[PDB]
Amino acid sequence: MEMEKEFEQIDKSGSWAAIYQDIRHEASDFPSRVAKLPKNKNRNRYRDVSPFDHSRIKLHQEDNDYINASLIKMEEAQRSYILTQGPLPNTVGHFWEMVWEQKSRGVVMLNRVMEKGSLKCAQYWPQKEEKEMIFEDTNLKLTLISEDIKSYYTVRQLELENLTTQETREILHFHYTTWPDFGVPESPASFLNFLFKVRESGSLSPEHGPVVVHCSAGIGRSGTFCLADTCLLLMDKRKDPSSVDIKKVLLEMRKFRMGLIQTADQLRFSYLAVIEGAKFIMGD
Numbered sequence: 001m002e003m004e005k006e007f008e009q010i011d012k013s014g015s016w017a018a019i020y021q022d023i024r025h026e027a028s029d030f031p032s033r034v035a036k037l038p039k040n041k042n043r044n045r046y047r048d049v050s051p052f053d054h055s056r057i058k059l060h061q062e063d064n065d066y067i068n069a070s071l072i073k074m075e076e077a078q079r080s081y082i083l084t085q086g087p088l089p090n091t092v093g094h095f096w097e098m099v100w101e102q103k104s105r106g107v108v109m110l111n112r113v114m115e116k117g118s119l120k121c122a123q124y125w126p127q128k129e130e131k132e133m134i135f136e137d138t139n140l141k142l143t144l145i146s147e148d149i150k151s152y153y154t155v156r157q158l159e160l161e162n163l164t165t166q167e168t169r170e171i172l173h174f175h176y177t178t179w180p181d182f183g184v185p186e187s188p189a190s191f192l193n194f195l196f197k198v199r200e201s202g203s204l205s206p207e208h209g210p211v212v213v214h215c216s217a218g219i220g221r222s223g224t225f226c227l228a229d230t231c232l233l234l235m236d237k238r239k240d241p242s243s244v245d246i247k248k249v250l251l252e253m254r255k256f257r258m259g260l261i262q263t264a265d266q267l268r269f270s271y272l273a274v275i276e277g278a279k280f281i282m283g284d
């Protein structure tokens with residue numbers, strides 16, 4: 001069923017809470033035993049948000065390989081994403097170790113460091129060119145190269161150096177700075193413009209490791225970003241774009257990380273973004 005008609009029928013019937021609970025009931029339940037080990041308590045922001053064992057990213061070290069991060073591998077769309085929590089004071093070195101080891105070209109940040117008067121993630125990148133950051137626990141150096149501040153987002157060029165080998169790489173930081181503290185954006189226009197800037201950069205392409213995507217827990221806004229991107233790519237690839245079923249794509253992605261899309265308002269927003277983004281790409 002054309003999702004735009006499904007959309008108007010859910011709106012007219014006011015049945016967004018019922019549709020969202022049906023997704024919650026059908027979602028996969030896989031073990032997360034490594035996340036719950038006592039040694040990993042200060043590596044988790046939220047007790048109820050953990051990576052599954054089967055899809056978790058492993059750090060390349062014998063001491064403790066754990067990070068709160070999941071590989072979302074979308075087979076038909078030929079896209080992969082790493083979804084992760086906002087870094088904690090004791091996991092900023094792990095975060096950049098993961099970017100290095102997975103060969104990522106982009107980091108997508110969908111939160112502010114402070115929201116609702118509380119810290120939602122560590123200040124994990126440098127704010128001034130002449131004040132670089134050294135992560136002694138993972139042997140990395142990170143330097144701010146340039147910053148472009150726009151009304152709805154900021155793009156940063158960063159240099160990450162592996163101090164062990166003196167190899168360097170350019171990382172692109174895409175920071176969506178205007179998601180409201182409560183609810184979802186009224187229009188998906190700035191969020192779609194942002195998604196198109198990340199695509200334009202090469203950060204989502206198969207010549208690179210997977211993009212790293214985060215918010216505070218790495219499931220709500222982060223889930224909206226990957227769900228919208230995958231649904232639009234399938235609408236381009238298939239003979240019948242009207243066959244793309246957003247609820248079935250979301251349940252496929254929930255095989256790889258729990259809790260993607262946190263509210264009925266985030267579900268409605270993801271439908272709006274896909275419907276509006278389909279028109280704009282259609283030369284329309």
Ligand SMILES: CS(=O)(=O)N1CCCc2ccccc21
Pocket residue numbers: 010011013014015016017018264265266268
């Ligand atoms: C009353 S509702 O269940 O249909 N609902 C649930 C929460 C999200 C939403 C957004 C716009 C309009 C209705 C809703």
